[PDB]
Amino acid sequence: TGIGELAAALNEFDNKIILDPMTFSEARFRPSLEERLESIISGAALMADSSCTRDDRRERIVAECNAVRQALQDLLSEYMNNTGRKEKGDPLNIAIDKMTKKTRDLRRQLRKAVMDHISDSFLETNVPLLVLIEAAKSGNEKEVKEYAQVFREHANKLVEVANLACSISNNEEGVKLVRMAATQIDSLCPQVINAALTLAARPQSKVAQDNMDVFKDQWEKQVRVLTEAVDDITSVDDFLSVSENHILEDVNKCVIALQEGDVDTLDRTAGAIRGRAARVIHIINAEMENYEAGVYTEKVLEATKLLSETVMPRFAEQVEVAIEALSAFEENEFIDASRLVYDGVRDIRKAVLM
Numbered sequence: 001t002g003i004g005e006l007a008a009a010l011n012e013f014d015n016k017i018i019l020d021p022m023t024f025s026e027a028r029f030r031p032s033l034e035e036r037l038e039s040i041i042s043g044a045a046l047m048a049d050s051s052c053t054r055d056d057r058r059e060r061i062v063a064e065c066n067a068v069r070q071a072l073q074d075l076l077s078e079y080m081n082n083t084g085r086k087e088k089g090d091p092l093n094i095a096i097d098k099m100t101k102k103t104r105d106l107r108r109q110l111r112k113a114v115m116d117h118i119s120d121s122f123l124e125t126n127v128p129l130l131v132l133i134e135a136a137k138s139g140n141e142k143e144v145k146e147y148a149q150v151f152r153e154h155a156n157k158l159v160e161v162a163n164l165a166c167s168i169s170n171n172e173e174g175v176k177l178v179r180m181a182a183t184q185i186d187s188l189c190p191q192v193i194n195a196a197l198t199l200a201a202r203p204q205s206k207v208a209q210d211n212m213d214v215f216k217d218q219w220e221k222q223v224r225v226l227t228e229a230v231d232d233i234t235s236v237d238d239f240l241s242v243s244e245n246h247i248l249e250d251v252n253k254c255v256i257a258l259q260e261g262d263v264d265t266l267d268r269t270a271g272a273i274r275g276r277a278a279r280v281i282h283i284i285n286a287e288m289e290n291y292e293a294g295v296y297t298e299k300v301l302e303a304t305k306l307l308s309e310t311v312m313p314r315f316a317e318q319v320e321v322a323i324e325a326l327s328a329f330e331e332n333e334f335i336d337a338s339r340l341v342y343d344g345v346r347d348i349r350k351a352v353l354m
Helices: 005-016 026-049 055-080 090-121 127-136 141-167 172-201 206-232 236-259 263-288 295-327 332-352
Strands: none
Touching: 005 026, 005 090, 005 141, 026 055, 026 090, 055 090, 090 141, 090 236, 127 141, 127 172, 127 206, 141 172, 141 206, 172 206, 206 263, 236 263, 236 332, 263 295, 263 332, 295 332
C-alpha cells in the first residue's frame, strides 16, 4: 500500500497547484504550497548529495530545485493577479504548465540520480560474502569481525538503493515487491553473519561449513530477488542513458590507467565496464518479456546478442593483452574495442527506443 513518498509528494503538489482563481488569496495557499515544495526539495537535495550521484547530475538536480522554486513564485504571482475572476486567464494558464513541466524535469533528474546508484551498487554484488567466507574459512576471529562489518555496510547500501528507487516510483505493487525483498535482506544479513562467525570459530566443522553454504546460497538468491524487483520499478530508458554515461566514464579511467601503466586500476575498471554491459543485457532481456515476439523484440535481441557474443569477449581479450604487455605498444586496439562496447550499448538502446 502506498507509492514512493517523494513521488506522492510531487504528484500531490501537481494537483494542489490547481486552484479556483476567484476564491484565491496568497495568505491562504502560499504557506502550504511553499512548504510542500521545500519538502520535495529537501528530498531532491538528499538525493543529490548521495554517494553515487555524479557531479553533473548533482548540478542538474540543483538547477531544477531552484527552477521549481522560482516557478511556484511565478505561479503564485499570477494567481494574485487573476483574483476575483471566474476563468483562468492566459498568463496564469501558461504559468501552470510551466510549474508542471519543471516538476516533470525535476522527476527526470531524480530518476537519473537513482540510476547512478543502481548502476554502481548492483555490480559484483557477491564479492563481500565471498570475502567474508574466505576469512571464516581461515579462523581469524579478529578479521572475520571486520569483514563482517564490511558485509553489513554493503548489505545496507543495497537496501538503501532499493529504498531510493521506491521513493520515486509510482508503481504501488512494484514498490511493495521491493520493500519485501529489502526486508528479507535485513533479516537475512545477521543470520549470514552468525554462520560466518560460527564457522570461523570452528573452521573444521562440517556442520558449520554446510550451514555457511546454506546461508551463502540463500543470500545470493535473495540479492537476485532484490535486484530484479528494483529493476522492475526502474525505467529502461533511464537505465540505458545512465549506463551509457558510466561506461564512457569507465573508459576514460582505463585510458588513464593505461597511460600510467596501472594494471590494478585497469583490471578493476574494465571489470565494471563488463558488469555494466551485462546488467543492460540483463535488464533489457527481462523487459522484452513484456512484449510479444516480433519485429521490435527481434531487433533488440539481435543487438543484445551481438554485444554479448562478439563485442564483450573481444573487449575482455583486448584488456588481457594490455595487462599482459604492462605486466611483462598500441592502445588503438583498446580504444577501438571500448568504443564498440559503448556503441553496442547504443544500438541496444536505439532498438529499445524504436
